[PDB]
C-alpha cells in the first residue's frame, strides 16, 4: 500500500509548504528529464565554482543527474536538477572565453571535444537540454560588500568576477577563488559599497591589506580604477513565508541521491532549518529558502523520483516517541 502525502497529512494533522512559498524552478515538475547515461557535457566544479570542469551523466533519477568528473575519483560525483544553471553544453567554454580544467591526464592546450568524443566513443549531452538576460548593473570588475558563506558572520571586500547569463561570480578580493559563489542581483548575501559602515558592521578588507584596520573603500576604488556596482542594481527579496511545522520534499546531505519528507524546523529570513520526519535532530540542517534541493509535496511523486517515507519508530537515529 502506496505512501502518500495525503494519508500522512491526515494521520498528522499537518499542513505542506504551498507550492507559492517556492521558486518556479524547485516547483516544476512538468519538464522533461532528457539526460542519458554517459551523455558528456560541461559545468562548473560546486566546491570550486570559478572552474569548469568535463561531465559524465553517472545515473539518472527523475528530475535529477548525478555528474562525474572525466577521469577523476566517483568520490567527487554529485548531483543537480535537469534545470541546474550550473551546467552547460559541450563548447561552451570555447564558445564563452572560459577555460577548461581537462580530464584527468590530460594537459589543457591539447583538449579537443571532437577528439574527446572519438577517444571515449562518447556523444555530448544535445544543447536543446540546457537552461545556460544579463543582471542588470553587474559587470565584471565592479566591487560589493558580500557575506563570505564559507565564515557567514564576516561582510567583506569583494568584486564581480564573471557574468554568465542572469548571475554573477561573487569573488573575495586577494582570497582563495575557492570561496567564490554565483549570485543574482536579488541575494541576500550582497550589499552595495559602504553598507557595512552604514549598518555600524566591521568590514574585512582584502587579505593582507596594509594597514587593515585603516582600510577606506574611495582609497581603494582610486587603488584599483574600479567602480562600485551601483545601488540601483541590488533587487532586495522579501523574506520567504516558510512557517514551522509546514511539510516538503528536500534532498538528503548526507546521501544525496536520496529525498525525504520534510519538515520545517526553524526559520530566518531567508533560510530554513529543515528536519526529516522520524529522525533524530542530529541531521537538521539549515538551507537557503532557493537552494535547489528543497522542493513541494508531490515533487518527487510527479517528478519520477522515490520518496524516503519518515523514519520508522524504534529504529536507530529515530526521534523520541
Request: net charge negative; hydrophobic share 35%.
Amino acid at each position: 500500500e502506496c505512501w502518500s502525502w495525503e494519508s500522512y497529512l491526515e494521520e498528522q494533522k499537518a499542513i505542506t509548504a504551498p507550492v507559492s512559498l517556492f521558486q518556479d524552478s524547485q516547483a516544476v515538475t512538468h519538464n522533461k528529464n532528457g539526460f542519458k547515461l554517459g551523455m558528456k557535457l560541461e559545468g562548473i566544479d560546486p566546491q570550486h565554482p570559478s572552474m569548469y570542469f568535463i561531465l559524465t551523466v553517472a545515473e539518472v533519477c527523475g528530475y535529477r543527474l548525478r555528474l562525474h568528473f572525466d577521469g577523476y575519483s566517483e568520490c567527487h560525483d554529485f548531483w543537480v536538477n535537469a534545470n541546474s544553471p550550473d551546467i552547460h553544453p559541450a563548447g561552451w567554454f570555447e564558445k564563452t572565453g572560459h577555460k577548461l580544467q581537462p580530464p584527468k591526464g590530460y594537459k589543457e592546450e591539447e583538449f579537443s571535444w571532437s577528439q574527446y568524443l572519438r577517444s571515449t566513443r562518447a556523444q555530448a549531452a544535445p544543447k536543446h537540454l540546457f537552461v545556460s538576460p544579463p543582471p542588470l548593473g553587474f559587470q565584471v570588475g565592479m566591487k560589493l560588500e558580500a557575506v563570505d558563506r564559507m565564515n557567514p558572520s564576516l561582510v567583506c571586500v569583494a568584486s564581480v568576477t564573471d557574468v554568465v547569463d542572469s548571475r554573477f561570480l561573487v569573488h573575495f578580493d586577494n582570497w582563495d577563488d575557492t570561496y567564490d559563489y554565483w549570485c543574482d542581483p536579488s541575494s541576500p548575501y550582497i550589499h552595495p559599497v559602504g553598507w557595512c559602515q552604514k549598518q555600524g558592521k566591521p568590514l574585512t578588507p582584502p587579505q593582507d591589506y596594509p594597514d587593515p584596520d585603516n582600510f577606506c573603500w574611495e582609497k581603494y576604488l582610486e587603488e584599483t580604477g574600479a567602480s562600485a556596482v551601483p545601488t540601483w542594481a541590488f533587487k532586495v527579496r522579501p523574506p520567504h513565508s516558510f512557517l514551522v511545522n509546514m511539510k516538503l520534499e528536500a534532498v538528503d546531505r548526507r546521501n544525496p541521491a536520496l529525498i525525504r519528507v520534510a519538515s520545517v524546523e526553524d526559520v530566518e529570513d531567508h533560510r530554513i532549518k529543515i528536519h526529516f520526519d522520524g529522525w533524530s535532530h542530529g541531521y537538521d540542517f539549515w538551507i537557503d529558502a532557493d537552494h535547489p534541493d528543497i522542493h513541494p509535496a508531490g515533487w518527487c511523486s510527479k517528478t519520477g523520483h522515490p520518496l524516503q517515507p519518515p523514519l520508522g519508530p524504534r529504529e536507530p537515529s529515530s526521534a523520541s516517541p
